[PDB]
Design an enzyme around this catalytic site. Structure first.
Site, PDB file in Angstrom:
ATOM      1  N   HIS A  79      54.681  -0.815 -10.234  1.00 13.81           N
ATOM      2  CA  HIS A  79      56.066  -0.366 -10.445  1.00 13.81           C
ATOM      3  C   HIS A  79      56.153   1.136 -10.326  1.00 13.81           C
ATOM      4  O   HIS A  79      56.493   1.847 -11.280  1.00 13.81           O
ATOM      5  CB  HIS A  79      56.626  -0.911 -11.751  1.00 13.81           C
ATOM      6  CG  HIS A  79      56.840  -2.388 -11.761  1.00 13.81           C
ATOM      7  ND1 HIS A  79      56.041  -3.223 -12.511  1.00 13.81           N
ATOM      8  CD2 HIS A  79      57.735  -3.138 -11.079  1.00 13.81           C
ATOM      9  CE1 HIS A  79      56.492  -4.447 -12.302  1.00 13.81           C
ATOM     10  NE2 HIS A  79      57.505  -4.448 -11.432  1.00 13.81           N
ATOM     11  N   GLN A 280      50.639 -17.945  -7.243  1.00 15.14           N
ATOM     12  CA  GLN A 280      51.488 -17.490  -6.148  1.00 15.14           C
ATOM     13  C   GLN A 280      52.283 -18.664  -5.569  1.00 15.14           C
ATOM     14  O   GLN A 280      53.484 -18.554  -5.412  1.00 15.14           O
ATOM     15  CB  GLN A 280      50.670 -16.734  -5.110  1.00 15.14           C
ATOM     16  CG  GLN A 280      50.231 -15.363  -5.606  1.00 15.14           C
ATOM     17  CD  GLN A 280      51.441 -14.454  -5.713  1.00 15.14           C
ATOM     18  OE1 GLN A 280      52.117 -14.154  -4.720  1.00 15.14           O
ATOM     19  NE2 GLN A 280      51.764 -14.028  -6.926  1.00 15.14           N
TER      20      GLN A 280
END
Ligand SMILES: Cc1c(Cl)nc(C2CC2)nc1Cl
Ligand SMILES: [Mg+2]
Ligand SMILES: [Zn+2]
EC number: 3.1.4.17
Length: 325
Positions: A79, A280
């Site tokens: 981030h 995932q």
């Protein structure tokens, strides 16, 4: 509390010219900013000018705003500043390919919202802040980090020579800050599930109306999710390298939880790396595929994002089956 760019940083950005080769490249949904780090602030200026125009913002204020935003993204594995520009680029590609559906005020507010959507991220999830009763969670009970990211955006705008929106009228200024607030809050994935469900119902029943403000807000919210998750729409080598950063950040959070005596969830446990491909597959089926599917229905020009997401889902299945690189 906001860090401010140096005169050399913003003046340097003012003189940047994007190489001509990249102009054709930047227009494409799959474009990866990865190999052009020195050019990221310049790429953002370019995108703002191409979508809004050179007269839209005072160049000096825009460059100062951009370089101070960069300064307020932390050295976390995911981030970070690279993520901010990646998300803003996806928004630019969406906006370019659906230009008139959006107002001049929406295009400027959304590009800015994307650049700022994860400002001052500390590398900790809303789950961590709420479970360990961090002061941020007391202040912002839900969408904790997203409320923080918006507060940080306003704080940068309040810095001397950084208010890029001051030349808007009193009504347009309050309107753009609302577009930004809603867009940043929509990046909380917890809100995405309900938003996508509401949009799918509106589209299927034929009630979806882009002249209706509440419907526009929802469509904008889905666009924010689509941009935030766009690492899943890149070419497979790029998508795989970004997943490494996503998990590095979550694993560091998991390590901190372990230090406090709380066992993390498997996705945040570095000793559980073997569960990543199944994780995932779960993420693509539960979040990404429905997101790009609904977005493609509402905005047909966004179809390349869905195609690329399906291709990466296929690659994750190959990893599970043992067919990797
Ligand atoms: C883009 C994205 C995000 Cl936000 N979150 C996750 C969590 C399962 C690891 N995966 C992806 Cl690919
Ligand atoms: Mg976020
Ligand atoms: Zn984000």
């Amino acid at each position: 509390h906001m860090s401010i760019c140096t005169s050399e940083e913003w003046q340097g950005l003012m003189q940047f010219t994007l190489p001509v080769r990249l102009c054709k490249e930047i227009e494409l949904f799959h474009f990866d900013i990865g190999p052009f780090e020195n050019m990221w602030p310049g790429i953002f200026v370019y995108m703002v000018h191409r979508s809004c125009g050179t007269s839209c913002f005072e160049l000096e204020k825009l460059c100062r705003f951009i370089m101070s935003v960069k300064k307020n993204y932390r050295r976390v594995p995911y981030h970070n500043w690279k993520h901010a520009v990646t998300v803003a680029h996806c928004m630019y590609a969406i906006l370019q390919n659906n230009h008139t559906l959006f107002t001049d005020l929406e295009r400027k507010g959304l590009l800015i919202a994307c650049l700022c959507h994860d400002l001052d991220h500390r590398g900790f999830s809303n789950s961590y802040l709420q479970k360990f009763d961090h002061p941020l969670a007391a202040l912002y009970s839900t969408s904790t980090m997203e409320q923080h990211h918006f507060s940080q955006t306003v704080s940068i705008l309040q810095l001397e020579g950084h208010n890029i929106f001051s030349t808007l009228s009193s009504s347009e200024y309050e309107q753009v800050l609302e577009i930004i607030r809603k867009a940043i809050i929509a990046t909380d994935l917890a809100l995405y599930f309900g938003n996508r469900k509401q949009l799918e119902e509106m589209y299927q029943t034929g009630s979806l109306n882009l002249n209706n403000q509440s419907h526009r807000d929802r469509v904008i919210g889905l666009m924010m999710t689509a941009c935030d998750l766009c690492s899943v729409t890149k070419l497979w080598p790029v998508t795989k390298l970004t997943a490494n950063d996503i998990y590095a950040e979550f694993w560091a959070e998991g390590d901190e939880m372990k230090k406090l005596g709380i066992q993390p969830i498997p996705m945040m446990d570095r000793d559980k790396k073997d569960e990543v491909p199944q994780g995932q597959l779960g993420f693509y089926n539960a979040v990404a595929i429905p997101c790009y599917t609904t977005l493609t229905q509402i905005l047909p020009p966004t179809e390349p994002l869905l195609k690329a997401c399906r291709d990466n889902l296929s690659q994750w299945e190959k990893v599970i089956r043992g067919e990797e690189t």
